[PDB]
Design a binder for this molecule. Structure first.
Ligand SMILES: [Mg+2]
Ligand SMILES: [Mg+2]
Ligand SMILES: [Mg+2]
Length: 46
RNA sequence: GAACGCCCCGCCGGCGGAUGCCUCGGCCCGGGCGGCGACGAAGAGCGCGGCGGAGCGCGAGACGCGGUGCGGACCCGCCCGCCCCGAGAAGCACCGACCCUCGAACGCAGCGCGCCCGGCGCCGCCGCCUCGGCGCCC
């Protein structure tokens, strides 16, 4: 034995696998073109 | 003397908000009811109307959207719109959805950043996968 310390053994780790979906329907958000842009600002400076 | 001041013989004006009458409000008693939340509550922030400050309401589907019933001429301003044996304004009741940030508040922080390309908090119960021990044995 080379190291004098005891560390936790390496053990298998699993990936997730939910039995039902937590978001069954994919809904929209704030961002989409024509909603992210509101209007232009019209001045003589502009 | 006049005038100022004071009293009222009377006629008018101010300033102030008492009195009287009125009341979509309080207070007391009795009867019901006893119905929140990780399926994200109570509370807080911000935003939403054609002209839109406050409060009510609503959530980027925002001063509301749909479905079943009922109702049957209006919609406080300016406009729009509806109008008829159904074509459908006000209003009402139940039901289905949408539901931004913070909050028990859940990737870390509170407004800035990550690991990973589905996602990514803590405790507990029951199972399951993979494992440690010079514990008791073989
Ligand atoms: Mg949306
Ligand atoms: Mg307002
Ligand atoms: Mg959070």
């Amino acid at each position: 034995r080379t190291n004098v310390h005891f560390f936790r053994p390496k053990t298998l780790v699993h990936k997730k696998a939910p039995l039902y979906p937590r978001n069954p329907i994919k809904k929209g958000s704030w961002d989409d073109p024509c909603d992210l842009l509101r209007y232009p600002i019209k001045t003589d400076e502009n």
